[PDB]
Design a protein around this nucleic acid. Structure first.
Lengths: 255, 203, 106, 144, 101, 100, 180, 49, 83, 252, 190, 213
RNA sequence: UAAAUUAUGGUCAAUUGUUAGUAUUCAUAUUAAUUUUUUUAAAUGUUUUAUCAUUUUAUAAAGGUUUAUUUUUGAAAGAUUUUUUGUAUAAAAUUUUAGGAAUAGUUAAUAAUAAUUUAUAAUUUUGAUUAGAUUGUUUUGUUAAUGC
């Protein structure tokens, strides 16, 4: 009485059901409008998928662009946190602190038996790439999901400097992956999605807090503008934030 | 059906101005082997060849079985000379199933707008996917059917050659991760609740 | 990601899916609120069927009668030609007075 | 399928090629040096080498650059027509003189029949003027 | 069937091909040659002929190389068989003078 | 396809046209050339080069109701209207030489 | 399968029927009546096209003379000719390979062609239909027997592939030293 | 209809053992043609460059 | 064939790779045994030789350099056959 | 006549043309119609080979919370009849149900009694079929019923089969087919190895038969008004078994 | 037959030798227009009717006709016509939905000339990227709603001015100054 | 099965190899949402609407499409019928059956079936609501049944549906769950019209897997 | 910014009115018609089946339509000893009337939702909705011929 008769919203024919089965044998009634939902309607940010072994081991070293002081990302993230809390007292123990803020442009499983020597050659490959580059301006706009909703992050948009930055980071991915046979997560040839994780469900909270952050808590900001900011430093850091807040600065490069 | 209906349907796929994938070759070679139309499983080779196509490891193994059964070493020596030579066993350091590599053939705007209409045409030529259909290294199979046909035709010497070379690599090199099943040749089962079925004592 | 593929046929945003990039304009508050609302329908289903499965059942009855009442019950081309009023012009002023015009869209 | 070099309709400057060139940044000119309507090539194509942009070489091209490779597998008459041409030695040796004689018996009969009829008409009308029937006399014109 | 086949094989006139029953001459859907049909302009099959510019192309009977192919590099087989006019032909023929000219 | 009659009437062509004449005694036989040529659209041939053809619609070829617009006797004697005096009518093509 | 059947024009089953090699031909004055032989389905719409498959030929029911050949002193040739144009090869593809039903007037023709055996309904009224009995039928097969080794061949090369790649001249496809 | 269904096969031994030969030959010719037009596209690509 | 793990070397890479020390390495005998092989090659042997693990930039310059070498080897091949 | 692909026609929230769900009901003889020809193959099984869970020693003892966690699908044979715990038993004498067990009994020891047991929870029903006497099967020494001590003991062995299920459940979750392993009779071969080996002389050829077969009684063609040609009628030679082109033995 | 002359006709059944069998329909009939209204009383408002109509389509005259040989067939090879269409995306205000305005070819045989024509399409764009103006490629699919059988298959140029206009906040395109053409002298003062 | 078994074998070997780089995600294509045909069809998890001739990597299936065969009382207008009602739920691989059944409860669109709390089963033996799907071995193939709190009573005739074909529908039945809506006395439009299966459809006796007649 | 031919190559384009100062498709002609002539039509009872049932037999009455009408093996062809599969509704181009303007169970997304979900929605002067004539895209007539 207010639309089509047999809408194409519900026009669906699933073919993992055998033939004839829905004809004369059996009914398969389900809800298909959630398995046919788009990454734009959920938040699946197709993160570089690490294979078996590199998935078994935890991130040891990680390349990250450092945020400067007196940001816009920091302040808009601060108001996002105020509203996370005024929305729910539940969700404070899931948010990442403001000081742990960084920009993740790659994680890497490094062995300690060849630790500092490999870190040095990696530093060569990083500085030999980011030497001629100018300081980088990026765009933060709209969040997404890592770990199937486990991680909420303010992706940097590909709309200002992702081209240059990804030539750089796929170069250093190729170098750390095929040149010096270090374990970056994915293929030596893949391009790791640079990301700004703003909250996360960690294995130490999976049990109580879940395996999927509640899309109601943050979804008002899933497509919010978080700001365009400039940055000058690509740092390889070892995964220990408790040093002085920001993770152990195992190497820096100024731009 | 006569056996030849695959063959006819392969050709009629050609006359249809179609690009017979390697799966349309594996299938069409199995179904004439089953039927014992081996001169036909050969002319499927020759159709694959007149097409100037690159028989992936699977397809070389296929035609090599055909040479085995027909008992002609010559038939197989050329597949060896032509295609399954740059096939090398998995050396201890290198990755076993090197991933699929070729991206989905795409274009940018200045690629699509300026380039001629005949360069963009993508009717899936089967020689665009050998880089991944040989990503799974059936080399031991290949060498094995090589040794087989060598024995069949009666070349003790070359037979020893293939067998020995294969065995040493077996002893020395790791094992290539075998292929996940051909998602199109051998068919997935569909989930069918067998309730409304003629039971064991139905009649 | 600004381009589809030729082999696949998939779109700009779907290759941007299969590489993880975010091509999307700034959405106005309207395009924001419509989308937040479309983002919460499954939380509504989970908070609906679970603590008022009476109302879940009540609207079950409402819709379950309606899927049999009404106009059509099978799917023919006559049934589900995705725009009845303009696919069938010979039948709009006399018989089917539901619609007052033969055309409403491009 | 076809292109601006095949289809005489494609090089219509009035609305097709004019927009093509206003898109492709070419110099589009009414009576242009390039037949389609383009005055010359655009900045983009001028700079960038396109020969291998886009797609590889469809490797049947070798079927032209190589003749030994293309063949027709089964010969000509195998599908049953080996005996279409009556006078090929294929048929001659398949059948043999007895069967070819048999098979041409009817043609021999045709000629022999024409000659029997002619020779009788000649016996009859050979004396050219006399009478033969109730009111029919010998006319040469039947023989002729 | 058996008694009829016995008498049929006893028939001498048989054992000849009946080309109506023996083969399907052209089983595909399309003719083996362009048969008087129209052309791109509508020049109906009589106003035209095959082999002109409307045909499929004939391709270069060579290879199309870049820089160092036939520009003074060396020579192909088409360089020893060609003969200068002064020196005689290998094999004698009694070509007519008039046809020679 | 009349464009290709000279093909489809040549024994060496395996895609030859096939004609069969079942005589009244059941015996199958294959066509005569004349019948083969009957099945195409009429073939005219007259090479004016050295010897004139017998071109149609003469004074003599045509009959009355076509030539003039009344029936006119076909007298073999004294047809003055064809400016003719007598007309011995021997067989059409008997006495002339064959090439003509 | 219809509420109010069409009465003179029901066939056996279904709306688009099996293909049938019909031989229609418009009824006007006998002089102007010649037969459109053609493949088509059983259940058509009112005209001869909407399930027309493949025009198959035309028949002249009117026996014509040898006015395309000269006046032979040959009887069987002087007899009137009855002419028809088939589509022999698309008939073989339809009849043989797609299995279209061969109606009885068209069959009455093609029988005369030599494609199909003379039909069921060319009944020599003047001779009776047969008398079957197992004693004599088995006593014959007993008497004259043909072998498995002569029957399996013909079964194969008469219903299955018959291009015997002559084992000797399969040598021409087994290459020589440069690849042998 | 023993002969009438003996033929309905024989005309699948005849219509296919003929489509075999004739699609073989159609491809041997459309392959010369396909390959030659492909070569010309490559050549005109050179002269364009 | 240009399978994974295979990429266009450099000159230093080539020196480090193809360095085995034997002396009965006749220039004009190794070269003729390579060139006759590349003359018996057939045009599909030049098919799979672009390592797929490259950007669009390098892949086309690879095809470029490759059809260069390929034309050059065919020139030498026809020259050597006329020779 | 083959099987079509998908329901493209109707809203699948209202199951329309679907052949209905078979539910074997314990009250009515259909329960035994299905579960009856199954027991005979498990009998030939446990008479050929040893399969573990058949020959128990006693009932299973499980709390009434876990009864339905192990039992449903449990089927085993005890030395004598004895109701397991938590059940009530109802004998059945319905001949329309008993009739099926004919093929059971004429191949093994004849069936003595048949019961349906229902749990005090009402939800686990045990069809319990008690057999009696010397078996007709050459039960093998390495069977399971051989360890059931029945073929060891003399005549009058009353062993009893139990099959537990939930009620109102289709003939799918009746896990009685998974024992359709067919094992032959080697006792038959057991003649040619012991003391009959010198006693039995085998004949390999055929003997010279000088006498042809004695013919059947002469055929009197039917005299009723026949249905007609059972070829053209699609009726299998006896409406029972055969090939519709092997139309032997329908009146002619 | 047609090629025969009226009085030389005999038999309207067959065609003896060859030619074209066809029914000589009677085009010459003085079709008329029966005035059932008055020049001041018409039950239409916009287009009044006062003389016979020429009826048909692919038959009206000037004989417009379908022509595939346009921008689209110059750029893309197609399986079936209309598949691929390039245009100035104009109108996207329906959430996740684009309106792509791309042209076809209308050839006039009589004149020997063309005019390609405009059409506001529906085109799905999951994830809302395109802004009014991005020259986009649009491809056809399975349908997406009542009216969208298309989806945004690429961008060929994104309106970077527009995208920044949104980022700053303004309307990515100012809206037309005036409405559709009316017939009433709307007197806007102050 | 020659596919499930073998794809599990290889899916397992793939992580029985640590010398494996990862998948090139730009080269691991997803599936297209827009395609040719007419419908918004769903193919498998391993399948693409287009041709992808590769043998892509056999990946673990995170969320399973679990199929639970309920029991919906249907109304052909000649009695009430028992027929198969699968509700195929996309459920993860890590979940406890308690939350799985909570999930199916939220998932169904016919609350004819989630009026009273029910339980799961596979070839009979119930599953506990404290362990998880792999705790028994639930794939998408586990030939699962579902059992209501009144399944052991449907041979009975007390709660069995009181249909107007053979039973008296009182006024109180005319304000209870199915019958307030079922539409007893035919409106000018027969308002909610249901199916209709003949009283002589199957023959003299009902539907069984084995031949009775 | 070169002539060239081994001499008609590749198969027919061709317009027939006695007017009346002059401008202008415009009375009288001829062609196809219609007016015009009984050599193409015609009948009723469909038919089986085991039986008060059931198997078989699916686009001519109009109905007024110009953003319009589109769809499969599962029936049948159709062949075996059994459970046997993935190919369908979508479109795309063309749409009339002298004086031309507003139209509406609405557009998209969610949806196997909302008789009261979300919203800056959709059709239109590139001529919309109402109303009017009209059966929609290899059949003719004329003309040397684009046309008409």
């Amino acid at each position: 009485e207010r639309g089509l008769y047999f809408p194409i919203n519900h026009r669906i024919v699933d073919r993992r059901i055998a033939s004839g089965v829905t004809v004369e044998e059996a009914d398969v009634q389900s809800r298909y409008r959630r398995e046919l939902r788009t990454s734009f309607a959920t938040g699946e940010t197709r993160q570089t998928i690490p294979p078996a072994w590199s998935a078994c081991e935890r991130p040891t070293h990680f390349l990250s662009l450092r945020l400067p002081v007196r940001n816009v990302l920091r302040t808009r993230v601060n108001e996002m946190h105020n509203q996370i809390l005024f929305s729910h007292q539940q969700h404070a123990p899931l948010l990442v602190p403001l000081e742990k803020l960084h920009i993740t442009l790659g994680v890497m499983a490094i062995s300690e038996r060849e630790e500092t020597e490999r870190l040095a050659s990696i530093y060569d490959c990083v500085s030999e790439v980011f030497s001629v580059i100018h300081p980088l301006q990026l765009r933060f706009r709209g969040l997404g999901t890592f770990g199937f909703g486990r991680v909420l992050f303010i992706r940097v948009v590909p709309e200002a400097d992702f081209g240059i930055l990804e030539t750089a980071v796929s170069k250093i991915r190729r170098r750390v992956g095929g040149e010096l046979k270090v374990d970056m997560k994915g293929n030596p040839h893949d391009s790791y999605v640079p990301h700004v994780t703003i909250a996360k469900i960690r294995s130490k909270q999976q049990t109580q807090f879940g395996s999927k952050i509640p899309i109601s808590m943050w979804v008002e900001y899933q497509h919010h503008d978080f700001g365009d900011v400039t940055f000058s430093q690509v740092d390889i850091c070892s995964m220990r934030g408790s040093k002085d807040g920001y993770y152990h600065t195992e190497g820096s490069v100024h731009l | 059906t006569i056996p030849q209906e695959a063959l006819h349907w392969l050709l009629r796929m050609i006359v249809d101005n179609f690009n017979p994938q390697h799966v349309h070759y594996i299938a069409a070679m199995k179904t004439l082997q089953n039927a014992g139309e081996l001169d036909m499983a050969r002319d499927v080779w020759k159709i694959m060849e007149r097409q100037q196509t690159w028989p992936c490891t699977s397809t070389i193994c296929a035609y090599l079985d055909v040479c085995v059964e027909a008992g002609e070493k010559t038939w197989a020596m050329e597949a060896w000379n032509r295609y399954c030579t740059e096939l090398k066993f998995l050396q201890p350091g290198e990755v076993d199933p090197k991933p699929v590599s070729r991206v989905p053939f795409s274009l940018t705007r200045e690629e699509l707008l300026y380039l001629p209409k005949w360069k963009k045409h993508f009717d899936h030529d089967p020689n665009l996917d050998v880089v991944d259909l040989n990503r799974f290294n059936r080399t031991r199979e290949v060498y094995l059917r090589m040794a087989q046909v060598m024995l069949a035709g009666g070349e003790r010497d070359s037979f020893q050659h293939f067998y020995t070379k294969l065995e040493e690599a077996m002893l020395s090199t790791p094992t290539p991760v075998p292929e996940p099943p051909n998602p199109h040749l051998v068919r997935r089962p569909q989930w069918s609740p067998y309730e409304h079925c003629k039971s064991v004592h139905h009649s | 990601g600004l381009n589809g593929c030729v082999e696949t046929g998939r779109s700009r945003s779907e290759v941007a899916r299969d590489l993880g990039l975010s091509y999307t304009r700034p959405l106005q508050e309207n395009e924001k609120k419509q989308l937040s609302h479309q983002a919460l329908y499954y939380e509504r289903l989970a908070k609906f069927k679970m603590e008022q499965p009476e109302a879940a059942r009540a609207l079950e009855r409402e819709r379950f009668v309606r899927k049999f009442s009404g106009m059509f019950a099978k799917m023919d081309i006559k049934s589900g030609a995705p725009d009845f009023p303009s696919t069938y012009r010979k039948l709009l002023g006399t018989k089917v007075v539901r619609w007052a015009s033969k055309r409403h869209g491009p | 399928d076809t292109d601006a070099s095949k289809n005489r309709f494609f090089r219509g400057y009035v609305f097709g090629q004019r927009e093509l060139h206003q898109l492709l940044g070419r110099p589009h000119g009414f009576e242009a040096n390039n037949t389609d309507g383009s005055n010359d090539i655009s900045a983009y194509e001028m700079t960038t080498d396109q020969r291998y942009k886009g797609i590889p070489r469809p490797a049947i091209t070798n079927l032209h650059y190589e003749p030994e490779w293309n063949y027709t597998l089964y010969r000509a008459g195998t599908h049953g027509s080996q005996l279409s041409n009556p006078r090929s030695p294929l048929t001659a040796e398949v059948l043999g003189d007895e069967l070819m004689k048999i098979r041409d018996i009817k043609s021999f009969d045709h000629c022999k029949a024409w000659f029997d009829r002619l020779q009788y008409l000649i016996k009859l009308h050979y004396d050219a003027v006399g009478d033969i029937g109730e009111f029919k006399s010998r006319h040469t014109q039947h023989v002729h | 069937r058996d008694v009829e086949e016995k008498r049929h094989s006893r028939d001498v006139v048989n054992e000849l091909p009946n080309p109506w029953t023996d083969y399907v001459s052209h089983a595909l859907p399309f003719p083996d040659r362009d048969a008087g049909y129209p052309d791109e302009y509508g020049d109906i099959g009589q106003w035209r002929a095959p082999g002109g510019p409307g045909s499929p192309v004939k391709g270069p009977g060579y290879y199309a190389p870049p820089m160092e192919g036939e520009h003074q590099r060396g020579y192909t087989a088409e360089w020893r068989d060609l003969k200068n006019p002064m020196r005689p032909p290998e094999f004698p023929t009694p070509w007519e003078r008039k046809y020679k000219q | 396809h009349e464009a290709l009659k000279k093909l489809e009437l040549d024994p060496t062509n395996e895609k030859r046209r096939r004609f069969v004449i079942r005589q009244p005694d059941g015996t199958l036989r294959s066509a005569k050339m004349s019948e083969m040529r009957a099945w195409y659209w009429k073939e005219e041939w007259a090479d004016f080069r050295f010897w004139a053809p017998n071109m149609e619609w003469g004074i003599e070829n045509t009959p009355s109701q076509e030539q003039y617009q009344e029936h006119v006797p076909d007298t073999p004697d004294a047809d003055f209207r064809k400016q003719r005096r007598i007309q011995s009518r021997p067989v059409k093509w008997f006495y002339e030489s064959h090439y003509t | 399968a219809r509420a109010i059947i069409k009465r003179r024009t029901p066939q056996l089953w279904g709306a688009p029927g099996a293909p049938i090699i019909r031989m229609r031909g418009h009824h006007v004055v006998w002089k102007f009546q010649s037969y459109d032989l053609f493949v088509e389905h059983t259940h058509k719409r009112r005209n001869s096209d909407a399930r027309l498959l493949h025009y198959l030929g035309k028949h002249c029911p009117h026996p014509q003379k040898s006015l395309w050949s000269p006046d032979t002193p040959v009887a069987q040739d002087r007899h009137l000719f009855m002419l028809t144009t088939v589509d022999v090869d698309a008939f073989k593809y339809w009849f043989g390979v797609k299995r279209c039903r061969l109606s009885m007037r068209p069959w009455a023709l093609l029988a005369k062609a030599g494609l199909l055996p003379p039909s069921l309904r060319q009944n020599s009224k003047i001779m009776p239909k047969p008398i079957f009995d197992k004693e004599q039928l088995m006593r014959y097969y007993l008497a004259n027997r043909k072998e498995e080794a002569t029957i399996e061949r013909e079964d194969y090369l008469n219903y299955k592939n018959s291009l015997v790649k002559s084992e000797e001249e399969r040598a021409a496809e087994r290459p020589v030293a440069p690849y042998l | 209809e023993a002969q009438f269904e003996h033929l309905r096969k024989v005309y699948k031994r005849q219509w296919l053992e003929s489509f075999r030969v004739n699609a073989d030959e159609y491809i041997y010719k459309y392959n010369i043609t396909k390959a030659a037009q492909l070569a010309q596209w490559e050549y005109e690509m050179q002269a364009q460059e | 064939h240009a399978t994974y793990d295979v990429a266009p070397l450099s000159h230093k890479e080539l020196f480090s790779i193809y360095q085995n020390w034997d002396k009965t390495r006749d220039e004009l005998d190794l070269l003729e045994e390579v060139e006759e092989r590349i003359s018996k090659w057939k045009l599909n042997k030049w098919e799979m030789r672009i390592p797929p693990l490259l950007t669009a930039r390098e892949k086309e310059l690879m095809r470029q350099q490759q059809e260069l070498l390929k034309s050059i080897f065919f020139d030498w091949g026809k020259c050597r056959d006329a020779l | 006549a083959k099987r079509f692909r998908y329901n493209t026609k109707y809203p699948s929230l209202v199951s329309y043309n679907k052949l209905p769900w078979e539910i074997l009901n314990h009250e009515t003889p259909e329960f035994h119609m299905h579960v009856a020809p199954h027991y005979e193959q498990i009998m030939t099984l446990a008479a050929s080979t040893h399969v573990p869970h058949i020959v128990g020693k006693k009932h299973l003892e499980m709390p009434p919370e876990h009864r339905l966690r192990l039992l449903p699908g449990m089927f085993y044979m005890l030395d004598g009849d004895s109701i397991p715990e938590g059940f009530t038993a109802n004998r059945v004498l319905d001949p329309t149900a008993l009739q099926y067990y004919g093929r059971l009994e004429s191949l093994v020891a004849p069936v003595q009694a048949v019961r349906m047991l229902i749990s005090d929870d009402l939800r686990i029903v045990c069809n319990s079929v008690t057999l009696q006497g010397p078996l007709q099967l050459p039960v093998a020494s390495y069977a399971s019923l051989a360890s059931l001590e029945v073929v060891t003991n003399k005549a009058s062995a009353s062993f009893t089969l139990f099959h537990f299920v939930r009620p109102n459940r289709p003939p799918s979750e009746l896990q009685l087919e998974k024992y359709y392993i067919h094992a032959p009779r080697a006792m038959a071969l057991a003649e040619f190895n012991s003391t009959s080996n010198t006693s039995w002389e085998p004949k390999l050829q055929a003997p010279k038969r000088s006498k042809r077969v004695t013919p059947l009684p002469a055929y009197r063609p039917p005299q009723s008004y026949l249905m007609g040609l059972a070829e053209r009628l699609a009726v299998v030679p006896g409406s029972s078994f055969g090939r519709r082109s092997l139309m032997w033995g329908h009146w002619f | 037959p047609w090629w025969n002359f009226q009085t030389e006709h005999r038999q309207r059944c067959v065609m003896m030798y060859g030619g074209s069998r066809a029914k000589n329909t009677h085009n010459a009939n003085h079709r008329v227009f029966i005035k059932k209204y008055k020049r001041n009383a018409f039950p239409n408002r916009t287009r009044h009717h006062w003389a016979v109509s020429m009826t048909g389509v692919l038959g009206q005259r000037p004989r417009r006709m379908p022509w595939p040989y346009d921008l689209t067939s110059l750029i893309f090879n197609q399986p079936r016509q209309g598949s691929d269409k390039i245009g100035y995306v104009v109108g996207t205000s329906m959430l996740k939905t684009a309106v792509v305005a791309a042209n076809h070819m209308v050839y006039y045989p009589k004149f020997n000339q063309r005019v390609s024509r405009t059409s506001r399409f529906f085109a799905h764009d999951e994830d809302l990227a395109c802004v009014e103006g991005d020259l986009v490629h649009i491809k056809q699919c399975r349908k997406i709603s009542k009216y969208k059988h298309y989806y945004v298959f690429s961008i060929l140029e994104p309106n970077i001015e527009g995208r920044e206009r949104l980022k700053l906040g303004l309307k990515a395109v100012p809206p037309p100054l005036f409405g559709y053409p009316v017939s009433r002298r709307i007197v806007k003062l102050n | 099965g020659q596919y499930e078994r073998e794809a599990f074998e290889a899916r397992r070997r793939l992580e029985e190899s640590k010398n494996y780089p990862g998948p090139i995600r730009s080269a691991t294509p997803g599936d297209t949402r827009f395609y040719a045909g007419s419908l918004e069809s769903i193919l498998q998890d391993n399948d693409r609407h287009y041709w992808r001739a590769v043998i892509d990597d056999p990946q673990v299936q995170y969320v399973i499409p679990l199929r639970i065969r309920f029991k919906l009382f249907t109304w052909v207008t000649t009695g009430w019928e028992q027929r198969l009602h699968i509700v195929q739920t996309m459920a993860p691989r890590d979940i406890t059956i308690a939350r799985l059944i909570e999930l199916v409860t939220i998932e169904n669109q016919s609350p004819y079936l989630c009026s009273s709390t029910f339980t799961l089963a596979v070839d009979g033996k119930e599953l506990d609501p404290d362990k998880s799907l792999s705790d028994y071995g639930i794939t998408e193939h586990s030939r699962i049944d579902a059992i209501e709190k009144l399944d052991h009573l449907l041979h009975k005739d007390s709660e069995r549906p009181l249909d107007w074909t053979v039973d008296e529908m009182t006024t109180e039945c005319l304000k209870r769950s199915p019958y307030k809506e079922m539409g007893m006395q035919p409106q000018p439009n027969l308002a909610p019209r249901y199916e209709a299966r003949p009283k002589g459809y199957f023959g003299r006796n009902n539907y069984s897997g084995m031949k009775q007649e």
